[PDB]
């Protein structure tokens, strides 16, 4: 159907620039405005501006003028957002979102204030002087101290990585039910740490193998760790 797909997570040093893409599919690209909205971790939504994919005209929020550039490639129905001179408080998830333009394009000098009816999945952008680092993965072994009434808890500790995010799956994606992957916490070392746990029947702890699959793309780190009692 209709979706917006954005590029992968980015890591940049302060002062550098970043460019996020937004590929549109399922509708007429030039028919709808394309907005960019960002969200800092645990914070609200902040509108950055829009581009008219048909004319190329733009409207940037005051806060980003002289810093932000919005462009598009009609032939591949992709919108682009480039933020320059990044600071640490530019660390956020960057969404693209479309709004209807019924006046496409038999008019000009007038913006139709439509709602943002379709949003991209978002792109995490971290701005830090810190070095990119792959995680160490340690098992959280199941035992009697992790059993209750026929169910057992086990998991993986994904420790000392930078930056966000990591993806954690279990048994190459086969195991999905009863999984809790916790929000990462930022340690005093400046490195992230995260745990993923799974509650399974204790009767299977001898006859079933459990491996957590950790993928930290910003450092090209892929680790599989077998979790044994």
């Amino acid at each position: 159907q209709v979706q917006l797909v954005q590029s992968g997570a980015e890591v940049k040093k302060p002062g550098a620039s970043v460019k996020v893409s937004c590929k549109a599919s399922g509708y007429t690209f030039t028919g709808y405005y394309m907005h960019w909205v960002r969200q800092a971790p645990g914070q609200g939504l902040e509108w950055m501006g829009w581009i008219n994919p048909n004319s190329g005209g733009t409207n940037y929020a005051q806060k980003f003028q002289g810093r932000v550039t919005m462009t598009r490639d009609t032939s591949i129905s992709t919108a682009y957002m480039e933020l320059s001179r990044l600071r640490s408080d530019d660390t956020a998830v960057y969404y693209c979102a479309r709004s209807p333009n019924p006046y496409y394009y038999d008019s000009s000098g007038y913006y139709y204030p439509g709602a943002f009816d379709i949003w991209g999945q978002g792109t995490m952008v971290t701005v830090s002087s810190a070095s990119t680092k792959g995680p160490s993965v340690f098992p959280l072994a199941p035992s009697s101290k992790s059993t209750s009434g026929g169910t057992a808890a086990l998991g993986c500790l994904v420790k000392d990585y930078f930056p966000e995010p990591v993806t954690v799956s279990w048994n190459s994606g086969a195991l999905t039910s009863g999984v809790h992957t916790f929000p990462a916490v930022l340690q005093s070392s400046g490195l992230y740490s995260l745990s993923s746990v799974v509650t399974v029947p204790s009767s299977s702890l001898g006859t079933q193998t459990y491996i957590c699959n950790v993928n930290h793309k910003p450092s090209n780190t892929k680790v599989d760790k077998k979790v044994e009692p």
Partner: protein, 210 residues
């Protein structure tokens, strides 16, 4: 730039009302977005009261004077999310978002299932020791996790994180990680986390004697 209450709590089946405050907001079109944890915002109401196809009739909207309101009738666990109102400001050519409202769905209190994990030998080999205390599927959110090492209370050497309300059973889970050097870890024998929660008649301790 628009005023919203940080939190709204409502029992399943009850009606949640989320207000969006702004001077003469009634003369503008107000849109509403629902953002579930870890997901992109979804349009639920546009132009004060219109709904996109696919959005249940339980969602309704109104706008007059200095207040716009998103009303969710017959609230259920799937309605757990942050809700943002939005307006286009013609006078400034900006889109303005509200500060957001987290809807929490009330439920019966549920005591956490507590589990504890010793550090792995592989981590131990690297010279650090991390021990993890897990509280699974509890309600409400307020919980106290205390680390004890040889009966002594720990401070400054642990971090915790909590999941948002589960989209089906309205519970939370918590993960607390105690971190020491391998040297300090070897000095002691008993490692314990002590959890306090409404669903616990008295505090509960999980431990291992190394």
């Amino acid at each position: 730039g628009l005023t919203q209450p940080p939190s709204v709590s409502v029992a399943p089946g009850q009606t949640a009302r989320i207000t969006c405050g702004g001077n003469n907001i009634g003369s503008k079109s107000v849109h509403w977005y629902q953002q579930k944890p870890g997901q992109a915002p979804v349009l639920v109401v546009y132009d004060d009261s219109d709904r996109p196809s696919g959005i249940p009739e339980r969602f309704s909207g109104s706008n007059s004077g200095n207040t716009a309101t998103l009303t969710i009738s017959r609230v259920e666990a799937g309605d757990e999310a942050d809700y943002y109102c939005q307006v286009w400001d013609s006078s400034s050519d900006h889109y303005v978002f509200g500060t957001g409202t987290k809807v929490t769905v009330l439920r019966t209190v549920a005591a956490p299932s507590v589990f504890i994990f010793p550090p792995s030998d592989e981590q131990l080999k690297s010279g650090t020791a991390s021990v993890v205390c897990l509280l699974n599927n509890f309600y409400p959110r307020e919980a106290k996790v205390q680390w004890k090492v040889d009966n002594a209370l720990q401070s400054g050497n642990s971090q915790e994180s909590v999941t948002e309300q589960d989209s089906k059973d309205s519970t939370y889970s918590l993960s607390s990680t105690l971190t020491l050097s391998k040297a300090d870890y070897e000095k002691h024998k008993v490692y314990a986390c002590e959890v306090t929660h409404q669903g616990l008649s008295s505090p509960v301790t999980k431990s291992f004697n190394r």
